[PDB]
Structure formats: structure tokens, C-alpha cells
Amino acid sequence: HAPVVFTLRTGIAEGRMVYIGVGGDIDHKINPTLVVHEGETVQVNLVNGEGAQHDVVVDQYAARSAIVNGKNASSTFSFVASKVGEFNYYCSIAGHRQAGMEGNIQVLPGNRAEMKSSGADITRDPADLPGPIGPRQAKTVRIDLETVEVKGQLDDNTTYTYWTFNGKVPGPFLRVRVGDTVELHLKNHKDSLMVHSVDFHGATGPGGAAAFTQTDPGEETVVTFKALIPGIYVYHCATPSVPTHITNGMYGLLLVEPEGGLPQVDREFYVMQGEIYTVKSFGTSGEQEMDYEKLINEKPEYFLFNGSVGSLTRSHPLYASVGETVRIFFGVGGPNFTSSFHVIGEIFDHVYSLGSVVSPPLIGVQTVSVPPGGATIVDFKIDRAGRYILVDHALSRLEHGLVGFLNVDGPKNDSIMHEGPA
Amino acid sequence: HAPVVFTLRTGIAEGRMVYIGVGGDIDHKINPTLVVHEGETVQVNLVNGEGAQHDVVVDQYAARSAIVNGKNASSTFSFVASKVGEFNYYCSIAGHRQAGMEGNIQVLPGNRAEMKSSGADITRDPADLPGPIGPRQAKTVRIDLETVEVKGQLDDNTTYTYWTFNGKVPGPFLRVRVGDTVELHLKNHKDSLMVHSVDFHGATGPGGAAAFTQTDPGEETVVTFKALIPGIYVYHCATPSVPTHITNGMYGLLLVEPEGGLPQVDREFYVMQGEIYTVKSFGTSGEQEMDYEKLINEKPEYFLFNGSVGSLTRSHPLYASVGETVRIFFGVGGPNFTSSFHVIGEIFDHVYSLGSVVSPPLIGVQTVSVPPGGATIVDFKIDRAGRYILVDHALSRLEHGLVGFLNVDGPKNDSIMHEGPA
Amino acid sequence: HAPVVFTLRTGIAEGRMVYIGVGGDIDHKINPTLVVHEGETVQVNLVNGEGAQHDVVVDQYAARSAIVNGKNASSTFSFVASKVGEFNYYCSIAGHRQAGMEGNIQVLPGNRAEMKSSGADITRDPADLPGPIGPRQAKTVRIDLETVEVKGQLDDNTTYTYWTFNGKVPGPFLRVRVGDTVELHLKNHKDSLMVHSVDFHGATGPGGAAAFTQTDPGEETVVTFKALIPGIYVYHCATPSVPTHITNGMYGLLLVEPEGGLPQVDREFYVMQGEIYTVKSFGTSGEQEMDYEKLINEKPEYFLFNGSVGSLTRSHPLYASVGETVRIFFGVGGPNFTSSFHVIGEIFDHVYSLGSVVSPPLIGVQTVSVPPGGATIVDFKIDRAGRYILVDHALSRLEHGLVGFLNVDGPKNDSIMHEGPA
Ligand SMILES: [Cu+2]
Ligand SMILES: [Cu+2]
Ligand SMILES: [Cu+2]
Ligand SMILES: [Cu+2]
Ligand SMILES: [Cu+2]
């Protein structure tokens, strides 16, 4: 999977100069044992706590941080845990290892256990969308949405109150044809504390339907609307506080197909990015709560593909085969951040700028900016095997949970890319 | 209009466990009375101050926050104040109401009073722009700007020292034809403390004219420059500190029309987005001042359309009628934030990407990313009535002042969108 | 060149009411002497420290700040230091000058000394790139990169440990033709602490080559890959922590030319933007260190073109002649911020949107958003003389080191732009 990340701050604790764990399974632990599995890439973040000179050296891997001099000075490093066994990490500054700066890394055989928590799985499988529509004539299409507030899994051993369409994040991928009439039935579950609604960016009229869909707990609201313009549209709850309903999970995509349909492709995926603003820092376990000051001042703790940490890496990666042309419908619920959407190891053959399905897509593009409340379509042929990586290329976000895998099976070496000279 | 928002934090004050108001008319008040008008959507933000378990419950409205457990934990909720009267809000956790956590919501008949302050109205009416140039050959054209420093209204009961072109924000919409020779006369009002100037993105040469227009208070500067390339351009003061002059209000748009003009439209509108960085938190009344730390580190307090809170909702909303084709000239003065410009309930028929007027517009677009120092043009046919909502879809900005209304009269229900089934 | 900036906070120090220097050569100095050279533009930022009313008045220049009233209230102003000599600056509030609020501005003849420090010059000269490839057929091209960790100059009297391709930032501009087979040899210098590697956005396959290029210090890695799709591609180090390797300087551009080559142009330039996250605030001299909290929370201290403060203003400005058509290859290493790239005084004739070289470029564009992990190409005819200014139009970044000069010699006044009436 992604690197396993450990943060260590230096300090004086239990009477000695030591390292102290930050977050994860090591939170506030003195000289924590870092437990890792054979073959994992292990990342260690060292932050200087008290202002003495420090590093971290990993005894048999010859991996080390840079030296860190003043308070807050930091160094980050990694190594592949290729050998099972127990290995010391320690500070190499004169006297510090003797003063107390030493702990263990345990490299265990086997695979890391699956993520678990007391929360429900609220992730949307990225293969979970309707396929292309027929060559139909326009018609009336009934859509059902239910709004549910649910304790969900946010990360291993970490939970959060999500608010969702149909129990997952993003909500259902809706797919209709230009000219269709949509008849929406919105039910707000009876255990909901809040009113919920929906605004479709592909709808024309008051609140994008939100003026007709403010729905009390236990009740239903119904609204009919015409789909007048093809495009790939975000939709989201539109009940005040709107950025609050959105951060909690109430966002989705609505595709309005052009008359002829989109170009035919072998496989399509559904991916949306959002932020969560928790009182505790990213990586702290337990029951997380929303922090309003962080929300309104745009200070996110979690950045997420499809609802959760590890959603598209461990829970349900994308899977395709070599030679397939693939399409990702990519949307940004937000509420706030522009995504720089990129698939590492591949190139977008076509990018539907700003979600326009009528204009000719752009050709041969590495990375696309997608604003919150915006969506695009990217298509590309997969020429060869590999683990391709979905990222927002504001790469600090990798460490706030933002990473997905597109797994394509086949040989490591081929004529498109291979080790060694030509 | 837009929800009336109240922030309550919990804590201990006057010898009891209580709610304490934050900002607005309730700042620092204990168990404050929330005064509200019939028909308003009321939003309450609860932030846990001291770490006991809390909620807010509105007696008779069946409206409540989620329970908030640790310090900083937060819950936002809203409700429509449909019934006139006096209603209790209280904490439902055992003992907390008797302990002192209770206040009153007064729902008054009629409408909320207008916004007032000891500041001048510095807002640009969105219909305040010159219309299409006729068919003309290119000619010499005189433009007059005056830089004025003025105490303006920022919000209800709140003021700020604005720096402006001609006393409003954005400055005058300038409109010339490609090939025009522009003779710009820039006067700095004698009462200004600062020198002021102007850089047009549509100008070719030193500082986009800024090298020629550094103008001492009481002086006049004159520069002539040719408009070589059609487009929709931002202009702004360019005297150091340029971000300071921009945040204070010194930005506007220059349209350089292409040869046959832009497509004819029923109505054109002029809107610009910018930020203000105050010492005090958004929503705190009184005389506001610039915070330089917040400016250079991009931590805004106010995000604004046309200069002021309520600028395009209560002061000068956009007006149009059903069936009209409408144009928005939309620019970001900034200084720093890219806008995700979106009109809730409508779809952009045409988007002039990156403000290009020569390249073919994109078709059928929900949301347009516009950088600081950039502008765009969006055109759309308004198919039906409703109140349409201009926003930056980084939606936390909603609750920092960034919202606008485009009001279109007519029935709620029609064939394009109506309540109930098809 | 760019404004000389001094920051003063007010306070009580050494027993009086005074101004105190913040950063630069005045840091923590009481009533500091601001030393400046004839003809420089001087900017003073005044920040209220203790809460009494203050301003700053420059004697004889008649330049002053606005009055600042509460703690943190700020006001910036500037003046041109046109007269050599010594001039008092003082607070005009009653009693404050006698209470101690007074210092000196020393305006010296001649030019400011060149930036110096104990660090290596790590800046890429923007003219340092290979020119257009012949109209040859596809072939095998060898590329060599070495990854080196080096103490570099960040600013005058300030250094940082940069991690680089080939000792400069950005790395070498790489230039191949679509269809080429690229044989990349990556050497990691034996004095490196870290493994380093390479991900090319122009490569197709595992990690964009990163799966094949994790290189221990003192070792080499070789990988061959085909350039399948023309485009302007970012490449960067891809060893965990990736945003750490990127912020330290490991980013560059790879052009995969289309079959015909790019349109012919008179002069090409190579510019990249990135951020540095130091423990100390921007403008603090000395040996700087990375701050991981600032990195991962996206709170930068330096925004940089080509590696360093003053890199494109004083060290290696861009130079061209009137009449030339100029091309800038512009990319954002990041790791985090999208750039609003603009050349003050010019307009882009052609913008290759999202870095697509297959799609028709956009025409007549003032400013372009470039995401981190993305690049574009902008072409423009320079019609007349002037000092043109490359900026990211999120203009607070000017004060964080983000500015560049394009120098075009010739007359100040002409038909395109001149002082006085038409
Ligand atoms: Cu140590
Ligand atoms: Cu909702
Ligand atoms: Cu929306
Ligand atoms: Cu309580
Ligand atoms: Cu000005």
C-alpha cells in the first residue's frame, strides 16, 4: 500500500531525553516501537521538540534523517523494510543515545491487518456507477435519494459522523440523457437530526432543486426537473450550513449524456475528493468531531477520495487491464479546495475542460485543476501494466489521506518501460 | 435573504455554565437573545468552549445541533423561523439547562432593518458598466480615473478604510475596441495619504502603465497606450505594497472588444471578487483595520463581491427577466484567492476560458475557475424564474460574505422545475 | 530592482516607546536605521505591537503610513529614495516622538551590494535549456541525472539544504521528440543522505519511472521508457516523503516535442515555481531548516522562481529585444500551490492550456492558472521596450520572494505607450 508514516518529536519525558510518538498507534508513547511489515515503505517524520541537535538513525538499514537543529526543525526520510527482525533507531548526536534517545522498529512477516473501527463503511466503490445509456429517446426517469447520518469509518480505529446520500460518500452516480425529465424522490431518514436537501448543478431553477427539497427527518420531498444541457455535474446537499453538509459527505455526480452518448470506453470509474475538518490532527485515532473554526478558515485535516482514508487503496482500488481505454468521472465536493488531479505513471488522452461535454476535450494532459463544485472527465488508454496512483498533486495532501490505486496486472518490464539500458 | 447566522460558544461566565455569543450583536453576551424575523432561515454555530458535553435545542421548532464532546468540537444547524414569538434554546445534556444553559430566540414580524453604518456605500452596482461599443473604426479615447481613499461600509455596523478608483469597488468598468488609443488621465484626490497608480492587463508596456502613473495626492498623471489585443482584463493600482492597494479596493475591469463586438445579449453585469484581511474576526462590528500578517500569509476574514457584505444581496442585487440571455463580466481582484465562480440554479452556456475573447468559448459549464488578476465572461439564457445565487464554490466563503443574488420574477412551478411528480 | 522592504512593529523596549525591526538586517533592533540606495523604492510595513495609536512619517519625503489603532493593526507604504542623505522617520501621534518613536533612513549613493551568503548558487538560469530539436526521426536519447544534496543560498545572508537534480533548481530542462526512447541514467551522489528517484509526467508506466529509480547514495539506476505523447511535463523526485523531496528543490521540466516541433520563436525561457517551508519567518537571515508542520499544513515561507530569492531579478534575469517573439516554459514544482502566472506589461498571445501541445493554444490571455505538478507554454511578441515582471498573481507572494524580471532595452516613450496626451 501507501507508506506507513510515523511521527516522532524529541523531548524530555519520564526523566530522560527521548523521542515521543505523535498520532497513530504511538501517540504520546516514549521511544515507541514502530511496528511494520516486511516489504513496507516506512516513512519517519522527525520534529525537534526542545531545541537540542538531533537525528534518527536506523541501525541496520542505514537510513537516517538529516540533523535537525532548532525547535520545530524537521526532517523526513523513508526506507523499505526488506528484512524481518528487530532494529534499533537512535540519535547519533554525541551523548543522546546514552541520554535515552533510542527505540525499536519491529519488521514482522506477513501483511498488515485490514483497517477496522467501530464505524460503518461509508466508501463508494469507484466501479459503482450505471454504465452508458442506450440509444433511447428522452424520457421521465425516477430517482430515489435517502439522506442518512451515520457513524462512519474515517481511518483505521477512527470514526466520524458522516451525512450522506444513500449511506456512502460520494452519493450515487446519477446518469441521464439530455432532454430527460427527472423525478426526484428525496427521503430524509427519521433518525436524522438535521434537515437535508439537494442542489444539482445540472438542474435549471431555484437552488438547483434545493428550493423544492428542504426535507425534514422522517419526510419526503419530490421535485421534477428537466435536464437541458449535457455535462458532468456535481450535486450536493443545500441546507444551511451548506459547507458543513458538504464536508460531512453530502456530494455526488450527475452525468447528463449528450444525445449520442460519450465516446465508448472499456471501463469507467467514479471518484470524488472532499475534506474533513476534525478537532484533532490527521492521524489521531478515536471518535473525531468537526471543528468549525478549521472549516470556515479552510484548515482541513483529512483530504479524501470516496469517503475515507484508504478508500481507494485498501478498501476498493480501481482495477483495469492492459490495452483498455479507461474513463474516470472525477468531481470535487470540497467544500473548499481545488484539486490538481493526476494519475501517476499515466497521461490523460482526453480532458473534458470544466466538465464541458459539448466542447472538444483537450488532448495529452498530465494534470487537471478541478474546482470545488466542479467535475471533469478524463479518458486514457492503459498501454502497460502497473500500479497507477490517483493524487491531488498538491502533494502534502498524500499525507492527509489523499491517494488511490489503479491496479493493472502484468509484467514489470516491457518495451514501453523497463529496467536497464535500451 | 442569506441566513442570519449566530455563533455560540459554551463556557463558564457570571458564575454559571452558559452560552456566550461570538461576533455580531451578541459578542461576549451571556445566553444572548437571538433576534430574528419571520420567514428567515436561522443558522446557529455551536462551538464547545470548555470540554463538557453540549448541544443546542430550539424549543417548539424541533431544531437542534448534534452533541459536541471535546473543546473546539462544533455543530452547525438551521431552521426557518416560520412562527412569530419568543422561544427557548437550551442544552439538553442532563443538568445543563438548570446549570444555566438557556437563552431566548425572538422571532419578530416584518423584515430585518437595512444594513447601516457610519461608512459610505462603496459598492459597485453590477449594472453599472458602459454597454457595447457600436461598429466604429479604432480611435483615440479619453479615460478619466480618480483614486479616492474613503471610510466605507464593510458590513452592518462595520467600517473599513477603502482605497478605490472613483469611490467604489470594483472601479469603473472601462470598455474600448481593439486598436483604440487610450489617453488615461489619473487624478489622485488631494486628501489621499498614499500615492496611487494603475496597471491595466490590457496595456502593453512598463507596468501595464504603472511606470507612467505613480500619482502623488492632488496631482494628475497622463499616459496614452494602445489596446493591441481583445480580451477582458483586470486593472489595479500598482504602487507598492501592491497586495495592500488591491485588498483595500483598487481593482476593476477593462474590456477590449474584438472587431465585431461580443455576441449581443439582453443584459450585461459587472462583478469582481476580492478579500479583506481585518485584525478582528469576520462578523465583529466596529471600525476594522488591516492585519498585515493575515494579508501576507493569505488568511482572509472577508470575501466580497463588489466591495461589501450584502453588496449583491441587499444593496444592489442583479435583476433580469425570464427568457433573457445574460452576460457576466467576472474578475478576481484578489489579491490572493482563486474563485470557483458558479451561479446556483443555472448553467453557463458559454465560458470564455481564461478571459480569452478570440478563442471559442467552452459550452455548457457549471463552475469556472478564475485566478486573482484574471477575469472571464460567462453567458447564459435564463430559462425560468427564481432567485439565482452567485458564489465562489469554495463554500466556506459563503459565511465570510461571498454571496450574490440574481432575481428573476415569475412562478415557482413550471415545466422546467416544479414540486411533485411528473 | 524589487522594493526594499522593512517591517517595524511598535512596542516598549529598552525603557521607552519605540519601533522594533522585524527580520532582514534590522531584526529585533530598536528604532533601526533603514539603509537604502539612491533611486530604490522603499516599502515600510508598520504593525501595531502594544495597542496605542501610531503611524510612521518620513521627514522630508512626505511619505507616511495610515494611523494604526489596535494591536496587530497594520499599514504599509512606500516612497522612492531619490535624495541621498539621512532622514528621520517618526510617529506623529502626540508625545510619541518625544517618548522615543524615531529612527533614521540612510539613503546612500550607488547600488546595493549583490546578494551574498555562505551557500552555493543553486538557481537555474532561465536561458539554460536545450533549443528546438531537429526535424529528425524518432531515436534513442540518453539522459543523465545526478541527485545532489547541497547547502544553497536561499536569500541574502540565508541558506538552506536543497536537494537537487544536478545541483540547480529546477533540474535540467529535458527535451525529446514524441516516439523517442529515453534511456535515463540516475546517479545519486555518494554524499547524499537520502535515496532519490525520478517520476516523469511524460513517461508511461510504474511511478512514471519512480518504481525503477529508487537510488541509494553512491549508486546508479537506469531505466528506459518511450515518450508516447507530446506535451510539457513536470518531473520530480518520487521518494517518500515526496512533498519533502519536491519542496527541497527536486523538480524540472521535460518537453516531448510534437512531430513538427513547436512554432518557431526568437527566444525560449525555462521557469519553475516552488515553495519552501522554513522554521523561521520569511526574511529571517541565517541557516534555515524545514518545518514539517508548515509543509504538511500548506503554510509556506518562501515562494520562489528558479530556486532562490532574487533568482530572476538580480542573479539571472530574462533578457530579450523589442520585436522578438518569446516563449516561456513555465511549470509548478509546488509541492502545493497553484500559480496565477502573469507577465506585468505583456499579454500572452498563445497559452497551451493545461500544457497540451496537441490542442490549439488559447489566444490573448492575461494570466494562466498552473497547478502544482503541471506546466504550460506561453508565447508572446514583445512590441516595445521595458522591464516586464513575472509574477504569480496571488500577489502577497511578491513579499515571499516570488518575482522575476524580463529586461527589454529601448526607449521609454513610443506609440504603443508614452507619457502625456495623444
Ligand atoms: Cu538527539
Ligand atoms: Cu444535508
Ligand atoms: Cu453547488
Ligand atoms: Cu451542555
Ligand atoms: Cu493605490
Ligand SMILES: [Cu+2]
Ligand atoms: Cu496585475
Ligand SMILES: [Cu+2]
Ligand atoms: Cu506612536
Ligand SMILES: [Cu+2]
Ligand atoms: Cu529525492
Ligand SMILES: [Cu+2]
Ligand atoms: Cu508528479
Ligand SMILES: [K+]
Ligand atoms: K496511456
Ligand SMILES: [K+]
Ligand atoms: K439556462
Ligand SMILES: [K+]
Ligand atoms: K505583446
